[PDB]
Design a protein around this ligand. Structure first.
Ligand SMILES: N#Cc1ccc(COc2ccc3cc(S(=O)(=O)N[C@H](CCC(=O)O)C(=O)O)ccc3c2)c(F)c1
Length: 434
């Protein structure tokens, strides 16, 4: 692609928007930037020569554009964007721009749960092979900050929103890890529309990797490689669990630092991707044994006085909290923090994990009331996570677990789930010691 001379408008600042701004400038193009927020993140970092419009979308700017670059945070269904599309104005996102420039194979990963873990795992596999890899996308660095002629492989986490605006990805290996209800605030045609967005990832992919246990990850119409628990090209053989490929044992999971069936299927998906990308097995399997987990993803931030305080702030949907609760061992009482922006999710599937005598709920943020409703008898509701932590802290006994696994976005009260996890860890440290 060639952008010289074009009228380019970027919709949405934050970090993604900023990376787009730099992309265009380096290429001799001064874009304009708009954001529906009066004061968006990154504004103070915007180059002074860049024209900006905040507090709404500017239709004069949109309808004048040769190219619109939409942040994943704005819906293509927004009436102004819909209008520009109707006019035949080209709309892309940061990932589209990256793909048109990228000169190394791309491993592309999406899914409702596990995508950041799998993305990071594949990155560590490439690093163990001595491959110069750039890892990011919807996790870590925005994709455009990774772009480098010296890069030998790219491993990108791609959200459903990023995928909606991308058409030029031809991944060496692509996966949808799973599809569970999420982002319903952005998909008014429901779960299948959300699935359709993720299914785009397989288009022109050299190898597709599907979850044998989730039919929604499969292309609607060679086959795909698959992973799964009891079935799959990559599967588990099971007081001991092994990773297997076509019936052959490849790793006893006692060698991994991650635990739980969820993380073992993540290991399988990552190995399938690594394999398809042509990475050596030895180094891929080595990476599985060294990887410690991501911050905010079922992270023990404090284990003190017989109490484990776990930061699972990255659980921003129901399937993610289910993953934390399913098979969870707690010696005494589970003090479970739920809340924030539920994105119109149905929280009911959580109820079956919440029976019996040793569960307490502390529900906060926008949808705290809806979460308390799961089992009002063991539930407290507060406005903030800090209030819930101060409420629960005195009730904590040796043997208890305090788990932030909110099943919601943090965006009603926090900058992002990382700020939420960091605040929880701060409070855990204060409240979990005498
Ligand atoms: N123009 C314009 C914009 C752009 C962005 C925003 C607000 O930013 C948002 C909203 C929602 C949203 C959702 C996502 S996401 O769906 O990919 N990830 C969130 C992460 C939530 C969290 O960090 O807690 C999720 O999974 O719910 C990423 C960025 C996001 C940015 C505007 F107002 C106006």
């Amino acid at each position: 692609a060639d952008y010289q001379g074009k009228n380019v408008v970027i919709i949405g600042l934050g970090l993604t928007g900023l990376s787009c701004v730099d992309f265009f400038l380096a290429r001799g193009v001064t874009p304009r930037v708009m954001d529906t927020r009066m004061t968006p993140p990154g504004l103070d970092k915007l180059p002074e020569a860049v024209e900006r419009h905040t507090g709404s979308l500017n239709d004069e700017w949109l309808m004048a554009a040769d190219l619109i670059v939409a942040s994943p945070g704005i819906a293509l269904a927004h009436p102004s964007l819909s209008a520009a599309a109707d006019a035949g104005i080209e709309i892309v996102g940061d990932i589209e721009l990256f793909c048109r420039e990228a000169q190394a194979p791309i491993v592309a990963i999406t899914g409702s749960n596990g995508k950041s873990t799998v993305t990071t795992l594949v990155g560590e596999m490439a690093k163990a092979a001595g491959v110069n890899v750039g890892v990011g996308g919807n996790i870590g660095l925005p994709a455009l900050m990774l772009l480098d002629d010296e890069c030998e492989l790219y491993v990108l986490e791609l959200s459903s929103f990023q995928l909606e605006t991308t058409s030029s990805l031809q991944a060496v290996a692509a996966t949808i890890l799973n599809v569970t209800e999420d982002h319903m605030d952005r998909y008014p045609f429901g779960l299948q529309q959300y699935r359709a967005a993720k299914l785009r990832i397989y288009e022109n992919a050299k190898v597709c990797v599907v979850n044998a246990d989730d039919a929604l990850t499969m292309p609607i119409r060679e086959r795909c490689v698959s992973f799964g628990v009891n079935m799959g090209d990559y599967h588990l053989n099971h007081g001991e669990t092994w990773l297997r490929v076509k019936g052959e044992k490849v790793l006893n999971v006692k060698e991994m630092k991650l635990s739980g069936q969820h993380n073992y299927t993540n290991a399988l998906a990552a190995l399938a991707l690594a394999d398809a990308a042509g990475l050596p097995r030895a180094s891929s399997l080595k990476a599985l044994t060294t990887f410690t987990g991501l911050p905010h993803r079922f992270e023990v931030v404090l284990e003190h006085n017989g109490v484990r305080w776990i930061n699972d702030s990255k659980a921003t949907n129901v399937g993610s909290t289910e993953a934390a609760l399913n098979g969870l061992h707690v010696d005494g009482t589970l003090h479970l923090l739920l809340g924030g922006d539920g994105k119109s999710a149905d929280f009911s599937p959580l109820a079956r994990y919440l029976n019996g005598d040793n569960v307490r709920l502390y529900c906060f943020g926008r949808d705290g009331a809806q979460l308390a409703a799961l089992r009002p008898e063991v539930a407290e509701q507060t406005e903030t996570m800090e209030q819930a932590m101060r409420l629960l802290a005195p009730r904590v006994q040796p043997g208890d677990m305090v788990l932030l696994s909110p099943a919601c976005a943090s965006l009603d009260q926090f900058k992002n789930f990382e700020q939420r996890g960091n605040e929880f860890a701060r409070l855990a440290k204060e409240l979990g010691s005498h």
